[PDB]
């Protein structure tokens, strides 16, 4: 399952590079909103596919998915529950989706605050689960309960990952409704270049 | 380098199982201190070889060594800077090295307190390094400085790992001087069975 995920993610990155390049070329050519929206929607569809493949990987090996060892070294410094922190990515793209109207500014900052609150609450719940596993493993005839208990805890860990990816996807979705097509394209370009620069830097660390 | 480490560690575990079994058989046969000390010293030599292979792996890929992803899932709940926490392992073996004399009790508790203090200080330094890398990567013509800076930071991370393994080895060494051969054998048996039980439990999580 993890081998399949790593191959799928490799191909996902190749397609990500293409979709980011396509939107770069479109912004530079100042193409109209209709053609540009197709590229925005393609980028959004591509992220949706990432979340799908991550959900499968979490079922296959939640610990590996959580370790971030499938991402590059520099990306791991910015990981929160199996991916990036949406509240921080909002700061990354903020200068590029500007200028924002007053209403858009209120909507984006609201979204950032609510994502921050959701991230903190999920982190607190995951912390409680993890500390409790530390304590319970430490204490721990096999009639089947130990494996069943392990599967309950794996399901609980997977739920945290799923909820974190849900928050990431929901934040991307809500930005796509706040922003015009052109603002969204600029934000997606910035987000894509951010991820690419982190991966490029990891090559220097290797 | 990491592929070589994982193969070396696999063979290390196979030999660990043999050395733990050999000392189990010896304790049960109530063999004399001279033959028993050979088995104690073999166990100590085997841990020394673990630290050697870990030092090579830290040079090859410090992040992988630190991730603990080369250990089994349940062991990762108990990892501190690239391995187990010596102060906690002292608690694991304490019931089995008993009865201790008053002097031995003072020496062991002293060692546990000093290891705890060293662990906290190393954790604080690693935390400062890591938070500073988060901040500096976030801020970050290439004339060679970015790679050189990465190598300085990798060397600093490797130093923390090396210092943590030094503390682990020093604690094992100092226990071997406090304890009689028979107490040491009982403690090594307990430590070995502890690690084996954690690995066995990880099979249930998989
Ligand atoms: C129309 C969108 C413009 C740009 C919006 C950026 C802010 C949304 C943050 C969520 C991005 C999700 C991608 C991360 C995937 C992962 O962590 O594995
Ligand atoms: C004579 C020794 C008796 C038993 C002493 C146990 C307490 C010492 C703790 C250090 C053990 C080191 C093994 C861990 C290796 C690792 O973390 O990678």
From Swiss-Prot, chains A, B:
Localization per record: Nucleus
Domain of life: Eukaryota
GO MF annotation, one: transcription cis-regulatory region binding
Keyword DNA-binding: yes
Domain named DOG1: residues: 2-206
One CC-aspect GO term: nucleus
Protein purpose: Transcriptional activator that binds specifically to the DNA sequence 5'-TGACG-3'. Recognizes ocs elements like the as-1 motif of the cauliflower mosaic virus 35S promoter. Binding to the as-1-like cis elements mediate auxin- and salicylic acid-inducible transcription. Required to induce the systemic acquired resistance (SAR) via the regulation of pathogenesis-related genes expression. Binding to the as-1 element of PR-1 promoter is salicylic acid-inducible and mediated by sumoylated NPR1.
The name this protein goes by in its record: Transcription factor TGA3
Organism, scientific name: Arabidopsis thaliana (Mouse-ear cress)
